[PDB]
Scaffold this active site. Sequence first.
Site, PDB file in Angstrom:
ATOM      1  N   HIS A 288       0.826  -1.196   0.000  1.00  0.00           N
ATOM      2  CA  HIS A 288       0.000   0.000   0.000  1.00  0.00           C
ATOM      3  C   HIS A 288       0.870   1.259   0.000  1.00  0.00           C
ATOM      4  O   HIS A 288       1.857   1.318   0.734  1.00  0.00           O
ATOM      5  CB  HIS A 288      -0.929  -0.039   1.245  1.00  0.00           C
TER       6      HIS A 288
HETATM    7  C1  LIG Z   1       4.988   9.479   6.908  1.00  0.00           C
HETATM    8  C2  LIG Z   1       4.470   8.062   6.960  1.00  0.00           C
HETATM    9  C3  LIG Z   1       4.338   7.316   5.814  1.00  0.00           C
HETATM   10  C4  LIG Z   1       3.859   5.993   5.801  1.00  0.00           C
HETATM   11  N1  LIG Z   1       3.761   5.345   4.608  1.00  0.00           N
HETATM   12  C5  LIG Z   1       3.320   4.124   4.614  1.00  0.00           C
HETATM   13  C6  LIG Z   1       3.182   3.385   3.336  1.00  0.00           C
HETATM   14  O1  LIG Z   1       3.437   3.837   2.258  1.00  0.00           O
HETATM   15  N2  LIG Z   1       2.688   2.118   3.471  1.00  0.00           N
HETATM   16  C7  LIG Z   1       2.352   1.502   4.672  1.00  0.00           C
HETATM   17  O2  LIG Z   1       1.939   0.359   4.623  1.00  0.00           O
HETATM   18  N3  LIG Z   1       2.496   2.201   5.828  1.00  0.00           N
HETATM   19  C8  LIG Z   1       2.929   3.429   5.816  1.00  0.00           C
HETATM   20  N4  LIG Z   1       3.050   4.094   7.004  1.00  0.00           N
HETATM   21  C9  LIG Z   1       2.661   3.395   8.249  1.00  0.00           C
HETATM   22  C10 LIG Z   1       1.149   3.392   8.521  1.00  0.00           C
HETATM   23  O3  LIG Z   1       0.692   4.722   8.464  1.00  0.00           O
HETATM   24  C11 LIG Z   1       0.864   2.725   9.887  1.00  0.00           C
HETATM   25  O4  LIG Z   1       1.457   1.423   9.941  1.00  0.00           O
HETATM   26  C12 LIG Z   1      -0.644   2.557  10.147  1.00  0.00           C
HETATM   27  O5  LIG Z   1      -1.337   3.780   9.922  1.00  0.00           O
HETATM   28  C13 LIG Z   1      -0.854   2.066  11.576  1.00  0.00           C
HETATM   29  O6  LIG Z   1      -2.170   1.552  11.680  1.00  0.00           O
HETATM   30  P1  LIG Z   1      -2.822   1.419  13.178  1.00  0.00           P
HETATM   31  O7  LIG Z   1      -4.180   0.836  13.028  1.00  0.00           O
HETATM   32  O8  LIG Z   1      -1.817   0.884  14.141  1.00  0.00           O
HETATM   33  O9  LIG Z   1      -2.972   2.957  13.666  1.00  0.00           O
HETATM   34  P2  LIG Z   1      -3.227   4.381  12.960  1.00  0.00           P
HETATM   35  O10 LIG Z   1      -3.671   4.201  11.538  1.00  0.00           O
HETATM   36  O11 LIG Z   1      -2.041   5.241  13.339  1.00  0.00           O
HETATM   37  O12 LIG Z   1      -4.429   5.041  13.828  1.00  0.00           O
HETATM   38  C14 LIG Z   1      -4.261   5.330  15.204  1.00  0.00           C
HETATM   39  C15 LIG Z   1      -5.342   6.356  15.526  1.00  0.00           C
HETATM   40  O13 LIG Z   1      -5.516   6.435  16.946  1.00  0.00           O
HETATM   41  C16 LIG Z   1      -5.863   7.746  17.286  1.00  0.00           C
HETATM   42  N5  LIG Z   1      -5.573   7.834  18.693  1.00  0.00           N
HETATM   43  C17 LIG Z   1      -4.339   7.777  19.286  1.00  0.00           C
HETATM   44  N6  LIG Z   1      -4.399   7.832  20.589  1.00  0.00           N
HETATM   45  C18 LIG Z   1      -5.744   7.926  20.890  1.00  0.00           C
HETATM   46  C19 LIG Z   1      -6.479   8.023  22.097  1.00  0.00           C
HETATM   47  N7  LIG Z   1      -5.921   8.036  23.311  1.00  0.00           N
HETATM   48  N8  LIG Z   1      -7.814   8.088  22.013  1.00  0.00           N
HETATM   49  C20 LIG Z   1      -8.397   8.067  20.819  1.00  0.00           C
HETATM   50  N9  LIG Z   1      -7.818   7.981  19.633  1.00  0.00           N
HETATM   51  C21 LIG Z   1      -6.489   7.915  19.719  1.00  0.00           C
HETATM   52  C22 LIG Z   1      -5.009   8.588  16.344  1.00  0.00           C
HETATM   53  O14 LIG Z   1      -5.514   9.874  16.182  1.00  0.00           O
HETATM   54  C23 LIG Z   1      -5.058   7.771  15.038  1.00  0.00           C
HETATM   55  O15 LIG Z   1      -6.123   8.172  14.198  1.00  0.00           O
HETATM   56  C24 LIG Z   1       3.508   5.396   7.027  1.00  0.00           C
HETATM   57  C25 LIG Z   1       3.648   6.157   8.211  1.00  0.00           C
HETATM   58  C26 LIG Z   1       4.108   7.466   8.184  1.00  0.00           C
HETATM   59  C27 LIG Z   1       4.249   8.248   9.453  1.00  0.00           C
END
Ligand SMILES: Cc1cc2nc3c(=O)[nH]c(=O)nc-3n(C[C@H](O)[C@H](O)[C@H](O)COP(=O)(O)OP(=O)(O)OC[C@H]3O[C@@H](n4cnc5c(N)ncnc54)[C@H](O)[C@@H]3O)c2cc1C
Lengths: 489, 487
Positions: free
Chosen positions: A462
């Site tokens: 992705h």
């Molecule tokens: C610059 C950048 C580029 C990236 N590019 C890629 C890519 O090309 N491909 C790829 O596969 N991955 C990429 N990633 C990684 C990807 O974004 C993460 O692996 C993924 O978003 C994590 O999914 P998750 O479900 O753990 O949490 P997230 O998608 O981070 O969601 C966590 C959510 O929790 C919320 N939150 C946090 N604490 C609290 C709280 N106490 N109460 C309520 N809500 C809260 C936050 O606001 C956020 O919306 C990239 C990351 C970054 C920083």
Amino acid sequence: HMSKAFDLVVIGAGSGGLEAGWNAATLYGKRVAVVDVQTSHGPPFYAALGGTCVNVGCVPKKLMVTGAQYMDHLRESAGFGWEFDGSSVKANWKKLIAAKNEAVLDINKSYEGMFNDTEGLDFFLGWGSLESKNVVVVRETADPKSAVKERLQADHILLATGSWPQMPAIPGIEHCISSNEAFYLPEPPRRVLTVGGGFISVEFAGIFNAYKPPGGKVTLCYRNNLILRGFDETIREEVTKQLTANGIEIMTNENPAKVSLNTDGSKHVTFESGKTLDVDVVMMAIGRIPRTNDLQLGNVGVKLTPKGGVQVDEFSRTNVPNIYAIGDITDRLMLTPVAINEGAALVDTVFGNKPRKTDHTRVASAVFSIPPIGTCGLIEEVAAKEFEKVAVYMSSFTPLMHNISGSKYKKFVAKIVTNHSDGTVLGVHLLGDGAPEIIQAVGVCLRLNAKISDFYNTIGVHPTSAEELCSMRTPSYYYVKGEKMEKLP
Amino acid sequence: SKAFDLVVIGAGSGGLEAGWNAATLYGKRVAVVDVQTSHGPPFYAALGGTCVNVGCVPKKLMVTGAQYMDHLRESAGFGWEFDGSSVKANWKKLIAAKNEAVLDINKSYEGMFNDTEGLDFFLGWGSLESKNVVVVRETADPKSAVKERLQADHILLATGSWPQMPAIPGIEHCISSNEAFYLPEPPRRVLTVGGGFISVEFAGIFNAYKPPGGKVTLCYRNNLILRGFDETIREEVTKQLTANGIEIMTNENPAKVSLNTDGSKHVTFESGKTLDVDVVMMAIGRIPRTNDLQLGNVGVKLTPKGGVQVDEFSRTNVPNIYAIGDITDRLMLTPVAINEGAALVDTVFGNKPRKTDHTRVASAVFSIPPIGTCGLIEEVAAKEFEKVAVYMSSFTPLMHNISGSKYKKFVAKIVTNHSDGTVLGVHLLGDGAPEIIQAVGVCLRLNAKISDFYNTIGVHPTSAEELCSMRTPSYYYVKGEKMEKLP
Ligand SMILES: Cc1cc2nc3c(=O)[nH]c(=O)nc-3n(C[C@H](O)[C@H](O)[C@H](O)COP(=O)(O)OP(=O)(O)OC[C@H]3O[C@@H](n4cnc5c(N)ncnc54)[C@H](O)[C@@H]3O)c2cc1C
Ligand SMILES: Cc1cc2nc3c(=O)[nH]c(=O)nc-3n(C[C@H](O)[C@H](O)[C@H](O)COP(=O)(O)OP(=O)(O)OC[C@H]3O[C@@H](n4cnc5c(N)ncnc54)[C@H](O)[C@@H]3O)c2cc1C
Ligand SMILES: CN1CCN(C(=O)Nc2ccccc2)CC1
Ligand SMILES: CN1CCN(C(=O)Nc2ccccc2)CC1
Ligand SMILES: [Br-]
Ligand SMILES: [Br-]
Ligand SMILES: [Br-]
Ligand SMILES: [Br-]
């Protein structure tokens, strides 16, 4: 002057012939001669050492499509913030053709040096034909009365002379050209008609459309209702729309009846319907036929098929024991990597004591239209004739980047066709940027009998277009005993 | 007070997959909490997650924008002529187009909540009050006003990660990728700190949009960027970034940052070297986002590294509390977090346990030019297998001899268990590599051997057909030691 003797004589130093010849000499120590009519690209004979792909085929056309893609890139860059003087943009066709010529000639020269250096691999310049079961004659021209340059004794003979454009017998056909001449036009045509619905007509329509001078227009005509027969029908319809959206006029159910010259020297095309079109170039791309006429196959009795190509069994053998045929001359799948595969398999079988036949199923291939096609395996209507239950998984959408670029007409299409009784993937069909690169490893999957669950269990990369192939778990619709329906009964 | 089958803290990649699947596939009652309904300051991530708001989605759009710097120059070799002196890169237009696309996705997720039975969104900061109670407050402060009290049979922690910032004097004058997405002007001189994919990707973005006289520098504390990727490719992307005007400072690490009177920043490295830049972006790592969750109220155990500890089915040590995604500090990829969320719900609310497979996950780096990879690099394989073979092809494609970017070598490497031909890893550098690699990830789930690749008929002309043209190893590892020939 004496004749020379060989284990293997190859007529045609092209995609298949060079693979067979090199493998026979370097892998198995055989003495090989290879015959071709010209040492480098272009008029008068167009194809030459290296074959049709190298000289007037896949290699130059891909460079020219890449050049044509910049018309889209320059326009699409503005959505991402790029600014420049749009009124200053010019597409210099002469520079494109000169760069292409230099690239192809470099390949020609490298092939020439391979022969100088390689033990048991010799090149002979001229027109090859069959005199007897074990003698190939090399003459100065395709006329069998022309002077003899060499006689090559051969234990085994490989026919690999390829194909040639077909030209319809209409009045004024002499005012028309084929793809061979298109590669050498001194100037890009202001108005051009490409005749035919296949990949060569479509690809060249895209090239001319990008390099046309101001006020130009590209028209493609096809005698049946929908271009690109043999490809996925959703993709056929979408390519038509996206060609149309980039300014190409597509005339379906139309066919030229005659061509004459206007008083200013332009071409006046009259169609069977009575419509007329004035253009500067008519390029015929209605098919290619195997090149057998000049081989004098009657001298030894090699049987042709009704279609006109050399008849072969699964191991590329003709009806004459020691004479073989591969590539376009067999009039089957006309692709460079299939000819190469057949050539390697033939040589492994004959000289390597390791028999092997080419698999002509599940061959991945591409169309370098703008945007391009990548495909492998069966289209759904073919599958529906062979399997009681067929499932089709389909995703179609304009990718987010083309909502910013402004080319919202560029829908990406991904389709997977399965045998629903066991999930086996029967075909995968793609339209959109990257489709020819995405589809290559799909061919490996199908040769490993992948099921739809193997795709869906794979974690996506992705953000890509390719990840759509790994995110489809529910059929869009089905075929049950040949009948299309959204749901199973 | 309100009752739910599942409460999800974090409306991100994994959390939205889990909540949507629980509600629509299993008829459960689901609540999902996030701190912001759309992208950007002050909290950056929001409904949709890090990938949607300040991650994969916007960065890919900006890398696409940056590629046009190459396309415009390279078009000349194919006969395109225009006034080069008139070209300029409007960063503000890029940022505005990016903002509109992200906002559209935010709004789409809102309507998804309004349209789905048993799937409710709550705005605020979630923490654990007790083993079956999730509290939502006004701010991250655990003493701000309670907005909701959600009792839950099951609780899912999915709060993602956050940029790590080193403890050096003047760190407050640095930014992270969060702020990079919203800079009002493209920095003229920028230092990106870190060797990983985020630093490398932003280096290429800033390099294309920098104003006249600009310069991008990337520094990395060790000897070679992009640890964990294929070594040939780490060296080649270093070379190709340099060829496009980016300065790579290896074996250098900022020791402090100070303010200059003109507003620019003065960086002092541990070595004594100094560098004045307009922006210092720290991209040295991301760490699990666990501090605001009050895990002490219930005793959820962390690993020594700060991730929430989980078993193969995403279960914490506290029954009925689960963790997925970046908060578990494993593979920080969006498709992995999605897969973990769906496996978790299938296990808890369906009758078929499912665990995510973290091996042979294909991924990419959208460097210019980009990387695509799946499976093991050769030095990791050499520790697990007695005989490893490496098949390698590296060349400048014909189109880039015409384009003039002769530095753009395509690299394709296949790593096998040489005892039985099994493909262990595939590593690609060059245009199209992220797209080529996807179906390679399917191949590795069919126990593909090198001969399965080589016996497949190629699609010509493509870069991808290189993967089906390699028959003879370039070199080997035997009992961990590299050698050109077998002994
Ligand atoms: C610059 C950048 C580029 C990236 N590019 C890629 C890519 O090309 N491909 C790829 O596969 N991955 C990429 N990633 C990684 C990807 O974004 C993460 O692996 C993924 O978003 C994590 O999914 P998750 O479900 O753990 O949490 P997230 O998608 O981070 O969601 C966590 C959510 O929790 C919320 N939150 C946090 N604490 C609290 C709280 N106490 N109460 C309520 N809500 C809260 C936050 O606001 C956020 O919306 C990239 C990351 C970054 C920083
Ligand atoms: C415009 C165009 C675009 C194409 N694009 C693609 C593409 O993108 N991908 C793809 O896979 N395929 C493509 N093809 C098809 C590909 O070119 C052929 O499938 C392939 O070259 C066939 O290989 P072959 O070995 O049968 O013959 P060829 O490669 O045609 O070689 C035959 C050789 O025989 C020589 N010859 C003929 N008669 C004699 C004789 N009597 N004596 C001596 N030598 C003789 C010819 O000069 C020629 O060099 C394209 C074809 C065309 C026309
Ligand atoms: C899993 N995929 C995600 C992408 N995708 C879309 O629908 N995308 C899209 C983007 C911009 C406008 C409209 C649609 C297909 C499904
Ligand atoms: C089978 N492949 C074909 C591509 N290839 C190259 O070396 N390519 C190349 C690039 C520019 C000039 C000449 C050749 C590797 C082997
Ligand atoms: Br011109
Ligand atoms: Br499935
Ligand atoms: Br660092
Ligand atoms: Br290192």
